[PDB]
Design a protein around this ligand. Structure first.
Ligand code: 3PE
Ligand code: 3PE
Ligand code: 3PH
Ligand code: 3PH
Ligand code: HEM
Ligand code: HEM
Ligand code: HEM
Ligand code: HEM
Ligand code: HEM
Ligand code: UQ6
Ligand code: UQ6
Ligand code: UMQ
Ligand code: AOQ
Ligand code: AOQ
Lengths: 93, 57, 248, 385, 126, 385, 93
């Protein structure tokens, strides 16, 4: 194995990060817990929070886009209708 | 799934690779049994078998 | 696009097979073949369908052996090196009315009648659009629409001018089972038969589809469960911070 | 040491699939490359098995696929899986490329990682196109005419290139036959390339839905993500099962069950969905040479993204103004696609034009602007003076 | 890679002009809220992307117990983020905390670099 | 560090082709794997380029190759190169495998290295056979009958396997078409495998025509061997040029310009030369099941070679008794081949039988014997008491 | 980079070998020599030595094999000749 180029990742025991002191972790065996850890009840009060916190950032842009869609759509059905052939002969040439 | 009804057969170990394949082998007949039945029934009258029945030549 | 160039949208009739659990109506298919044989065979090839393929679906082994041999396919030359005919076998593909592209057009004002074997997929709407173009030849080409010599009007075709004249006229087919040989019953069948023709695998395809999903769904839910288990230590994992005396 | 670590072969297996240290915090978005490798494998298996009954001669071509449909045992399953799968390949790949924009994966040290995926994406379009030209229905013969013809756009030599590339006067027989052969070749090139793609991925490891450093809380891909990835997998197969058995053509164009005909283009030229947004961009340009260029540029521009992102953090996650336009971008891109389906009628053309602008402007203009602003909001939005 | 030295220039200016400052900072304040990040125990200097030399001059330099601090937050971040949740409301970093603890060094180092860049291409007039 | 070392991609390139530390002493024998990789590349390029004009339908098949011959521009060069090249592939590969016996490369730590090449050698026979079945001349249709039929030798299921594998009553059309498709697939498998083969090679590095340790006098592959390898390369192309333009069929069987015919086997069944020594071994056994087994065993037995070599040194170089039988082995193997060409007449059958014995006895008997003796000559041939 | 399995090769400066002391090498630029270093003359006295030292180990086995070849070859031409059809009817069944 020749030299390797330095990066920002290493493997365990030299992962690359800064030198941890102070934190203390605790966990419990996946056997040692309720099957269905926390389902329904209060785990769903979040299925509306994970929603709220973001929806606008999608809806607002989806909105802008879906109304713009509907508009010229309507507008096209018109100028290709009877009631529209007028405007057509003008807009189109 | 009930802790009694499971632990009976398997005590406190998972299924074993071969028992799996065994179940697989069995399941695969038991299933294609059921589903092909429920489907031939759901479409009763419509099957060429049901139509072969009435129609004569 | 003017609604005339587009063609009128065929409506959602409620077919025997529509739905995830629905085999064709084989009795219906059986009728369509007659409606096929007596009416449209006059002009339309059905070349990618083979006699044997009918057996067990619309007919019975001889029933299709009978039909089969009513036609003389080409057959390997005698010992001299000169042609010969022979009746058909179940191994054969239902012969076209015409000997080539030309005579098909000669016999139709220069129109090329589409091979029908794949029609219910080579068109948008398909089953519906097939039914509707067949039960949608109205009496007269709408006020103002001026129709060319040898062309009919259909709202369901694009720009109405269809080179195929109407062909369903009540009872022209003698429905062997004894059903109202109407035009909306002559038609609904050849559609269900032509559906089959382009999608023979059909009833098995939903059969197997059934199995695939039931098993696959269960795996999905099963997989999920499993995941939360193996994650359970990381999910409910909980840290704490205690700053440390400054000496290093 | 353990054997899987020691062995020449199993050490790779371990270090890319078992013992790999992943950020602890990554979510189901990251399951896409996994599900990407799964499609490529579905493409290659079902393809080969089908090729065994395929004929690439311009006569037998269209029929032989019908052969695979009507005759070969489970052959219809072979086709509907190949075809629907190619689509899911493309969806999943967009979602994979999405994820990379949103969390700003394209961003150093991961540039090469990113860049290579742009090569893959190119090769996947090249691949799937050829596989389409191999059905030889209507959409096939005319698809194959236009793509061959993009090369005329090349000054001088351009027509000849096309003639060559055709092997004769038209998209004829020496054409479908090379399109079959090149369809065989290329997927191995993607796989070749997926390997360098995974090598880049490997030396830096995955990012996170937080755009901070992973190196403080890693966990090993086995058994978490191996099991996590298994959830998206089955789900993937389920929807794919759904299409394949129940909606086999709810994704294809009926013009393609019509045998290709070199004299008569249809009058409904909708191309593949995953392709549409480019068809749109192409059309948007009333000039031939420029139009071509702009279509290709629609994909290349993806390479500036690490320079124009001016930010100081990777990720729209803590980025409101960034999120917002990011979904204008997504939604534009879908609209652009709707434009591709509709006729070159009004106002559609002019709508098409505006989206196209929005498209490139997002990489080239919105992003470096917004991100520079967003740096400055981050400063004054706290400090004293 | 828009420069911090450069964000300083712009953001200092805006902070100084009582004209600008009154217009901008309300928004900026509104922004560094909508970000969500102080709800994952994160100070803003935590967020700064590190995979580049300057930040690695700037973390090697960052006082010990300060790095232990960073660390806990960064792990607390990930941990919570993966729990698909937000911290106990009273664990959130509070508006007075979100202080540019890192920014001197980043600036300290940026400065140092731009200097060396210059001093590598320093020309001569005779 | 330098860039070629630092880059994710160029570091491999460097470490396997530029900066690799080779034993200082290795000779032109070692140029074989290099020249091996060159054939595999000649096979794959010319193959694909030919496939563009090939049809794998049992009708068009034989003709389409004539098409490639009479019509495609430089197409004859495409064929004669594909075909003659496959041979040179096989020569060079034997010489490569020779070299490995003689200098006892097969010998630890290089077992896996060795073993994998046995897999490659198997895949190359599988590959080239299928490529032959794709001409669909006489030798093709009957070659393809017998190999398909080796599977009947399998208890019970054996006939069905063959039926399956045929896709019908005989080596028919679903056969040549799968044989074409599998011919496409497999060479990528060889290449896949050449990579693990080169990985094994890499972690131990090459041996030497002295069977001692390299680690005292290494030099870097660039620029010595890169240039050394270039000498064997051109020379390789020269002889290949010679055949390709002047002796294009001095290596093929004329029965193959005859369109395959399923009713009439010829009466001169000479199979490919690189295959002959196995044809011989196969025939040597008046029992069907056993005969098959023994043919396959003729290749597998190659895997015991690191156990039966009992020696204490790697290399026939300082090994007189070893050299000697080593060339009996080579020369047997060639004779065995001559036996394959001649009719099952006398004394040929009985000669065939004896060679076959000599063959397996060389791995299984001569070698461990001789080498054990040779250990003891090495002891008493010096020391006092 | 995880742990790698030990072998019997390393790269330069850790090649794997034993710890060299005593040897002293000398060489001269490929530019600084006669083009055609030593060709013909006495470089060919070896093209007969590199031959001699081995030829027997090939010739002897080639011999054994080529005479055995010629023999049954002859023997086959015989029993399939006129003069031979006798022995045939016997050896062959
Ligand atoms: C193809 C591999 C066949 C083979 O015979 O490889 C044997 C290999 C030996 O184990 P190895 O780790 O090489 O022992 C130390 C010697 N250097 O054992 C192996 O390499 C087994 C590895 C299995 C390969 C799975 C890769 C997917
Ligand atoms: C395909 C590769 C295209 C590409 O854009 O790669 C850019 C790559 C960048 O150089 P890099 O060594 O990655 O810089 C340090 C960042 N980790 O530059 C390269 O990797 C160039 C390598 C050339 C690949 C030749 C392999 C044969
Ligand atoms: C090459 C062509 C240009 C690029 C093509 C992109 C094509 C369009 C992408 C197709 C749509 C894929 C989904 C895109 C959304 C990414 C999801 C995401 O970033 O989630 C974070 C985003 C917020 O992430 P969080 O802030 O960390 O929770 O999740 C959502 O807001 C909901 C996304 C719903 C869609
Ligand atoms: C898989 C089937 C079984 C294996 C197949 C082997 C097939 C036959 C191999 C074909 C013949 C290849 C040449 C074999 C001679 C190896 C050359 C060699 O070892 O040289 C060392 C050998 C002596 O090496 P030195 O002692 O180090 O000079 O060179 C010769 O003696 C001359 C070889 C002339 C041939
Ligand atoms: C069950 C009975 C029949 C059915 C379902 C049927 C169906 C069709 C269909 C689907 C088309 C395709 C047009 C399109 O969708 O673009 C077509 C065209 C045509 N048909 Fe029929 N057909 C039937 C009977 C007949 C008969 C009896 C004749 C003449 C004797 C005929 C002659 C033609 C011709 C000449 C065309 C060409 C029209 C064009 O090019 O637009 N068909 N038919
Ligand atoms: C054959 C197609 C592809 C395959 C098999 C593939 C595979 C993968 C895999 C397995 C990962 C790790 C899991 C994940 O992060 O999603 C990944 C991540 C990534 N991919 Fe791909 N990918 C493909 C397409 C692409 C494309 C088309 C691009 C860009 C145009 C791309 C750029 C990236 C980047 C930048 C990452 C790092 C994401 C992160 O930091 O989490 N990939 N890819
Ligand atoms: C990246 C991998 C691949 C992609 C994206 C891809 C894409 C496609 C597409 C879009 C089609 C037309 C499908 C249809 O509408 O019927 C197709 C057809 C086909 N492909 Fe592939 N392909 C891939 C790999 C392969 C491979 C490895 C083979 C091996 C032989 C193969 C063989 C075929 C054959 C024989 C057809 C014609 C039959 C059919 O259309 O279903 N493909 N491909
Ligand atoms: C695709 C076919 C092959 C390729 C591309 C290939 C490639 C190579 C290369 C490049 C080398 C280094 C140069 C050399 O030592 O000759 C090598 C050596 C070696 N090969 Fe292969 N080879 C192939 C076939 C085989 C086969 C068929 C076997 C055994 C059945 C084998 C076993 C070995 C061994 C044991 C070495 C080490 C030789 C030494 O110590 O010098 N190879 N091979
Ligand atoms: C290890 C690599 C390969 C080997 C050993 C091999 C072997 C062969 C052989 C012995 C033949 C019959 C040649 C003749 O007597 O005419 C053949 C034919 C053929 N091969 Fe390959 N082949 C290889 C790779 C490929 C590849 C990658 C392709 C890609 C399409 C290909 C395509 C063909 C075609 C189309 C033919 C029929 C035309 C011809 O026979 O020359 N081969 N192959
Ligand atoms: C850094 O983070 C990661 C991460 O690294 C990885 C690896 C995964 C897991 C992802 C993967 C394992 C994706 C890997 C993708 C691939 C390996 C794709 C490669 C696929 C190929 C190269 C296809 C090659 C296929 C063949 C050769 C099969 C063909 C063989 C055939 C057809 C034989 C059949 C023929 C006959 C005649 C029977 C993650 O989820 C992840 O996220 C946390
Ligand atoms: C330890 O000692 C060594 C040693 O390690 C090496 C490496 C060498 C040198 C040997 C090598 C470099 C051999 C390497 C062999 C290979 C790399 C073979 C691998 C070849 C492939 C994997 C083939 C793949 C080919 C393709 C994908 C090309 C196909 C592309 C095509 C056909 C495009 C054309 C199509 C169109 C439409 C234009 C030695 O000489 C040596 O001895 C001292
Ligand atoms: C790619 C195609 C894949 C096809 C389908 C694969 C099916 C896989 C079935 C493998 C079953 O493999 C099975 O795994 C279980 C763990 O759940 C193993 O169980 C083992 O560890 C468990 C703990 O998890 C212990 O209780 C038990 O004492 C031990 O034997 C068991 O040895 C093996 O029998
Ligand atoms: O006219 C076209 C056309 O222009 C495309 C388009 C779609 C996008 C293609 C594309 C090529 C390369 C890239 Cl990198 C992206 C998209 C270019 C061809 C088609 O796919 C098509 C299909 C069937 C009939 C006609 C047509
Ligand atoms: O009868 C045979 C025959 O037996 C082989 C033989 C040659 C060696 C083959 C072989 C297969 C597999 C391996 Cl691992 C080695 C050799 C087996 C078939 C042929 O190649 C052949 C070619 C043309 C006509 C007839 C025949």
């Amino acid at each position: 194995g020749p030299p390797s180029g330095k990066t920002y990742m290493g493997w365990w025991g030299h992962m690359g990060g800064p030198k941890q002191k102070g934190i203390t972790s605790y966990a419990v065996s996946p056997y040692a817990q309720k099957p269905l850890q926390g389902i329904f009840h209060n785990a769903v009060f979040n299925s509306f929070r994970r929603f709220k916190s973001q929806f606008l950032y999608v809806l607002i842009p989806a909105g802008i886009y879906w109304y713009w869609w509907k508009n010229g759509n309507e507008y096209n059905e018109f100028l290709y209708s009877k009631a529209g052939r007028e405007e057509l002969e003008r807009v189109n040439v | 799934s009930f802790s009694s009804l499971y632990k009976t057969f398997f005590k406190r170990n998972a299924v074993f690779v071969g028992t799996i394949f065994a179940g697989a082998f069995v399941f695969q007949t038991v299933f294609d049994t059921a589903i092909t039945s429920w489907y031939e029934n759901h479409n009763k009258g419509k099957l060429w078998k049901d139509v072969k029945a009435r129609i004569a030549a | 696009m003017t609604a005339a160039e587009h063609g009128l949208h065929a409506p959602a009739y409620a077919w025997s097979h529509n739905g995830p659990f629905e085999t064709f109506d084989h009795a219906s298919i059986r009728r369509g073949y007659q409606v096929y044989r007596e009416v449209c065979a006059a002009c339309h090839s059905l070349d990618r369908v083979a006699w044997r393929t009918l057996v067990g679906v619309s007919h019975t082994n001889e029933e299709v052996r009978n039909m089969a041999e009513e036609f003389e396919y080409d057959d390997e030359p005698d010992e001299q090196g000169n042609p010969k005919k022979r009746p058909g076998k179940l191994s054969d593909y239902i012969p076209g009315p015409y000997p080539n592209e030309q005579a098909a057009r000669a016999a139709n004002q220069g129109a090329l009648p589409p091979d029908l074997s794949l029609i219910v997929k080579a068109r948008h709407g398909g089953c519906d659009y097939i039914f509707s173009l067949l039960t949608g030849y109205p009496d007269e080409p709408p006020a103002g629409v001026a129709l060319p010599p040898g062309s009919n009007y259909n709202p369901y075709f694009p720009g109405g001018s269809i080179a195929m004249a109407r062909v369903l006229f009540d009872d022209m087919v003698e429905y062997e089972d004894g059903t109202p040989a109407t035009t909306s019953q002559m038609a609904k069948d050849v559609t269900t038969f032509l559906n089959w023709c382009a999608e023979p695998e059909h009833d098995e395809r939903k059969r197997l589809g059934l199995k695939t999903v039931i098993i696959l769904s269960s795996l999905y839910l099963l997989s999920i469960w499993v995941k939360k288990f193996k994650w359970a230590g990381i999910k409910t994992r909980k840290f704490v911070f205690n700053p440390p005396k400054p000496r290093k | 040491m353990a054997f899987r670590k020691s062995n020449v072969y199993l050490s790779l297996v371990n270090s890319y699939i078992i013992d790999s240290p992943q950020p602890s915090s990554i979510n189901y978005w990251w399951n896409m490359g996994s599900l990407l490798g799964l499609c490529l494998v579905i493409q290659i298996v079902t393809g080969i098995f089908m090729a065994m009954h395929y004929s690439s001669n311009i006569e037998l071509a269209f029929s032989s696929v019908e052969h695979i449909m009507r005759d070969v045992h489970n052959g219809y399953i072979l086709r509907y899986l190949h075809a629907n799968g190619a689509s899911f390949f493309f969806m999943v790949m967009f979602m994979h490329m999405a994820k990379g924009l949103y969390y700003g994966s394209y961003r150093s040290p991961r540039v090469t990682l990113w860049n290579v995926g742009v090569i893959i994406f190119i090769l996947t379009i090249a691949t799937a196109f050829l596989g389409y030209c191999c059905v030889y229905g209507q959409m096939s013969h005319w698809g194959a005419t236009v793509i061959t013809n993009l090369f005329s756009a090349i000054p001088f030599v351009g027509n000849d290139i096309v003639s060559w590339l055709w092997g004769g006067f038209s998209v004829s027989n020496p054409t479908i036959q090379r399109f079959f052969a090149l369809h065989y070749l290329v997927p191995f090139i993607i796989a070749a390339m997926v390997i360098m793609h995974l090598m880049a991925l490997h030396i830096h490891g995955s990012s996170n839905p937080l755009g901070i450093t992973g190196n403080l809380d890693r966990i090993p891909m086995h058994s978490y993500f191996i099991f996590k990835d298994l959830v998206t997998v089955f789900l993937f197969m389920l929807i794919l099962a759904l299409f394949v058995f129940y909606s086999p053509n709810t994704l294809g164009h009926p013009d393609n069950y019509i045998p290709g005909n070199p004299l008569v283009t249809p009058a409904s030229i909708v191309p593949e969905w995953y392709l549409l947004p480019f068809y749109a961009i192409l059309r948007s340009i009333p000039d031939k040479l420029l139009g071509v260029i702009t279509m290709f540029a629609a994909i290349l521009v993806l390479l500036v993204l690490p320079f124009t992102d001016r930010s100081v953090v990777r990720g729209n996650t803590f980025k409101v103004l960034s999120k917002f336009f990011f979904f204008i971008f997504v939604f534009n891109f879908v609209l652009l696609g709707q434009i591709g389906a509709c006729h070159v009628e009004v106002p559609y053309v002019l709508m098409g034009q505006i989206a196209t602008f929005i498209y490139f402007a997002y990489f080239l203009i919105i992003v470096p602007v917004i991100s520079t602003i967003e740096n400055v909001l981050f400063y004054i939005g706290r400090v004293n003076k | 890679p828009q420069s911090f030295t450069s964000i300083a220039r712009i953001g200092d200016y805006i902070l100084k002009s009582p004209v600008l400052s009154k217009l901008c900072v309300p928004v900026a304040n509104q922004f560094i809220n909508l970000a969500g990040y102080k709800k994952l125990g994160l100070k803003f200097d935590d967020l700064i992307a590190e995979e580049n030399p300057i930040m690695q001059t700037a973390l090697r330099r960052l006082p010990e117990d300060e790095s232990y601090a960073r660390a806990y937050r960064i792990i607390r971040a990930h941990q919570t983020e993966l729990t698909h949740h937000l911290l106990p409301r009273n664990e959130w970093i509070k508006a007075q905390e979100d202080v540019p603890y890192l920014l001197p060094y980043i600036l300290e180092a940026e400065a140092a670099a731009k200097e060396k860049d210059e001093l590598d291409n320093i020309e001569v007039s005779k």
